[PDB]
Ligand binder design. Structure first.
Ligand SMILES: [Zn+2]
Ligand SMILES: [Zn+2]
Ligand SMILES: [Zn+2]
Ligand SMILES: [Zn+2]
Ligand SMILES: [Zn+2]
Ligand SMILES: [Zn+2]
Ligand SMILES: [Zn+2]
Ligand SMILES: [Zn+2]
Lengths: 177, 177, 179, 179
């Protein structure tokens, strides 16, 4: 068994506090909670007021106690008590199973949300890369055109140089005369 | 159930005293015997010294007690307790059956002794009857013998009378003389 | 521990037994004779059993493997329910035996008290016959004493007659002597 | 409520199931297939089963008549022993199911943490690619400015050379004027 206090859920050995609302708590939490005049079950918040609604029970009873607790009772009474005890145990097992299923469901939900956040950033990261790739291609095309303009300007510069040199020779020839 | 005190053997309801030696007693006998520091079980004379060797148990437990006495225990423990309680009940039933068989045997023994005495008194009186009948037969034999003697005496009487008459006639004849 | 519910059998049941939905159990011989028919009549209470499960041929000392597997896999609620019904059958059989024994004890006590009345009355009767014989013996004694007294008186009369005859003889003899 | 002990089935068991002496239960389909073999091996624990009562096809929803009659006639000690073994089987199935669930939860937690590590590494890769694009964008801007500024400077030198050509042309015209 495990403590039905949500923050403890520790394996129960020795002394435990059992409630009429089918809950069981460890010795420390049971003593602290079920010794107060206002007694509220920490699990289901049920208002327990009766004397037998709360019992401090040993989970490993001695041989003599087991041999004498139900001695003298009719078989119907013994069967009824055994039925109620096993009903308590099955309820505790069912609650533990539901708690584990809930935790597994929470883990699956966390994984799906994590995948959603990651995929949202995937699509964001791909768009930034594609946008930068498009900008780089546009700028490289502009650089290609400007280099072509550079080739034309250098050709005009060399052509002007040769025409300038031709005028140099004509000027020098007329100056010498 | 019945009180294991021999002189009580009353149906047990409400409160009873149960022993580790598989015996149960009524409230009055249980309290009286189990208030002694030197307390010995009246049924089997077992030396009881332990705490759980003596329990005052309610034979009609409340619903809340039945739902909480074994609440929290493992199914194996509950099975063990139920097994020992049913073992106690079967032992008590078996002892009651043996007691009833013992009472039937005692009744059979009393009947056989009753026939035994009755037959003896018949035989004694039958011999008395036979002795009286034998005496009566002897009386009848004596009666017949005396009747025969009476007849003989009557014959002697008539013979004497006739002789007396004949001598009377002779006397009368000599009277004429 | 159990007994055949047939009234004239009441034999201890071991090995195979036949259990009925009528809360009755019989030995193998009674069950085989009666519980092989499609319509089943309970030998104890004559109830008409017709269902398949109304009659079961069960071993009373089951093997360990059978005990471990017959209810294996069933939920605890089902197992408790089956145990409760099985114990209900056992208590019903125990109650029947207990009531039968108590009724027999009551019958024995009534027979015992009737025998006490019968024996005492027969003893009182036998005392009457003893008194009857005693009265007869007294009557015989009285009659015999009466006859003895009658004989004694007649004998006395006879002897007196004898003395009278002797006296007459003497008178006659003296009378003869005179003449 | 129970589940087939075959690992690839684990289906909720209702109606008929196959129970083993080694404390395992399987669905009708897997039980029929496995336990029709002469070499029949329990798929859960690989135990070699050979006995008769090691294999039972049990109904998980027994009729009321069956529940009232299956254990009828047995002693209370026998019924208690059967109940103990049946509850022992149920607790074993619950314990094995609990261990399986705990193992799967541990595996799920480990896989979840591994996916978080993998996702962060993939994000780290994309951040590296983003920095690579940042570096090339800076390179394009540096190339753009350097090339255009050098291109503009060469154009300015061309215009200065053209104006110097005009100056020489004017001086040549003046030299022509004098002659
Ligand atoms: Zn706690
Ligand atoms: Zn509660
Ligand atoms: Zn008493
Ligand atoms: Zn005792
Ligand atoms: Zn019947
Ligand atoms: Zn019979
Ligand atoms: Zn399966
Ligand atoms: Zn197995």
């Amino acid at each position: 068994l495990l403590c039905n206090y949500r923050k403890c859920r520790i394996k129960l050995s020795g002394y435990a506090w059992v409630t009429a609302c089918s809950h069981i708590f460890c010795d420390q939490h049971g003593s602290g909670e079920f010794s107060r005049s206002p007694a509220i079950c920490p699990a289901c918040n049920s208002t327990l007021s009766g004397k037998l609604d709360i019992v401090r029970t040993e989970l490993s009873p001695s041989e003599e106690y087991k041999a004498m607790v139900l001695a003298g009772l009719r078989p119907e009474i013994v069967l009824d008590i055994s039925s109620r005890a096993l009903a308590f145990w099955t309820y505790q097992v069912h609650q533990e199973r539901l708690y584990q299923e809930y935790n597994f469901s929470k883990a699956e939900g966390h994984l799906k949300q994590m995948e959603k956040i990651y995929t949202q950033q995937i699509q964001s990261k791909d768009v930034e890369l594609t946008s930068m790739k498009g900008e780089v291609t546009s700028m490289k095309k502009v650089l290609e055109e400007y280099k072509k303009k550079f080739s034309d300007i250098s050709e005009k510069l060399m052509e002007r140089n040769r025409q300038y040199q031709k005028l140099q020779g004509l000027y020098d020839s007329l100056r010498l005369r």
